[PDB]
Amino acid sequence: LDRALAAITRFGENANNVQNRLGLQENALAQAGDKMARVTELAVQSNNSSLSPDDRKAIASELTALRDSMVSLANSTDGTGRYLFAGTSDGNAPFIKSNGNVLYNGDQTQKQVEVAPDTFVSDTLPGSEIFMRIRTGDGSVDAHANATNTGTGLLLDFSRDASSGSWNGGSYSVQFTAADTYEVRDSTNALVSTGTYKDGEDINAAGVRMRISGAPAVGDSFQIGASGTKDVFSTIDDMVAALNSDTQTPTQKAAMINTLQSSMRDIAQASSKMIDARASGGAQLSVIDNANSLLESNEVTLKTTLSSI
């Protein structure tokens, strides 16, 4: 009897504890989702290349405030002051500022909480899985205008492309040998193909594709390869720093817009990760309800057994 009663007491406490934490997580991430939606909107506006330096600086200012509030939300606690987004190292704040970057000092472990016999409900997400471990580009491939380009070539978009072959995961460089001519080269600087450039026409090779507009100069290049991972705070920081740049020449404007288009892509990926994280938090709420109703059936059996004896 004593072992059975301890079990149900434990189930009741476990259910209440995980229910609280999951509720505070939904609140925190709802708030973070609103901020993330405003960051997304500002990223879209940042890609309006007609904005004044003054308009850009306003957007940069707001993005900085949003980034800071996101850090505070990432350090949310549960009302025993245990951190929500630190995994199992929930005693010290998991998101810490170092040299203009945000570091994650929590762990990767998501706790499973027994709410009924053999029936587990996940506790809150480790912060790494909301804020840090975010793929760039389109999630699969990423591409950038080279930082040293002297022309006005915009990288408008890119993707995997089943038409030019099955992409092997490798990196490639599209390099202009003339105003209207490019070469595509692999990791080893070896020639894969050449092509004629026309504004907005797809450049296709090696299982990947890109679209370029404007006027690339001879020697300008564009790199394309596997996506990396970048935390959302760095993505916002890099967008802010780009917006604050001077754009006196067509070349400088093109450099900023390339950087801002890339930031926006990476932001789109961070937005998708937040959607998913938020959604995951609701998925097991019916099991908590079921655990709670089973516990109500236990009240009825306890009360009748108590009355009998």
Calpha distance 68→72 (Å, rounded): 7
CA angle 126, 127, 131 (to 5 degrees): 140
The resolution, in Å, is: 1.9
Q: In this structure, what are the phi and psi dihedrals at residue 63, rounded to the nearest 5 degrees?
A: -55, -40
Calpha distance 298→237 (Å, rounded): 54
Residue-range domain boundaries for the chain: 2-135+271-308, 140-226
- Experimental determination technique: X-ray
Amino acid at site 280? S
Bridge-partner residues for 141, per DSSP?
Answer: 226
Tokens for 22, please give them: 């999951």
Bridge-partner residues for 222, per DSSP?
Answer: 145, 174
Calpha distance 96→75 (Å, rounded): 9
Q: Indicate the helix (H) or strand (E) that contains 270.
A: helix 250-280
Pick from 162, 143, 124: nearest CA to 278: 124
Calpha distance 228→207 (Å, rounded): 18
Q: In this structure, what are the phi and psi dihedrals at residue 158, rounded to the nearest 5 degrees?
A: -165, 165
Tokens for 82, please give them: 């245990």
Q: 208 with 263: CB under 8 angstroms?
A: no
Calpha distance 136→36 (Å, rounded): 16
Residues in the chain: 309
149 burial type by CB count under 10 A (0-12 exposed, 13-18 middle, 19+ buried): buried
Q: Indicate the helix (H) or strand (E) that contains 143.
A: strand 141-145
3-state secondary structure of 174: strand
Calpha distance 39→97 (Å, rounded): 20
Q: 123 with 87: CB under 8 angstroms?
A: no
Q: 140 with 270: CB under 8 angstroms?
A: no
Inter-CA distances, 245 with 53, 240, 255, Å = 8, 9, 10
2-135+271-308 classified as CATH 1.20.1330.10? yes
Tokens 């850009």 -> residue: 56
Q: What is the CA radius of gyration of the chain?
A: 26
Calpha distance 130→133 (Å, rounded): 7
Calpha distance 245→144 (Å, rounded): 18
Q: 249 with 207: CB under 8 angstroms?
A: no
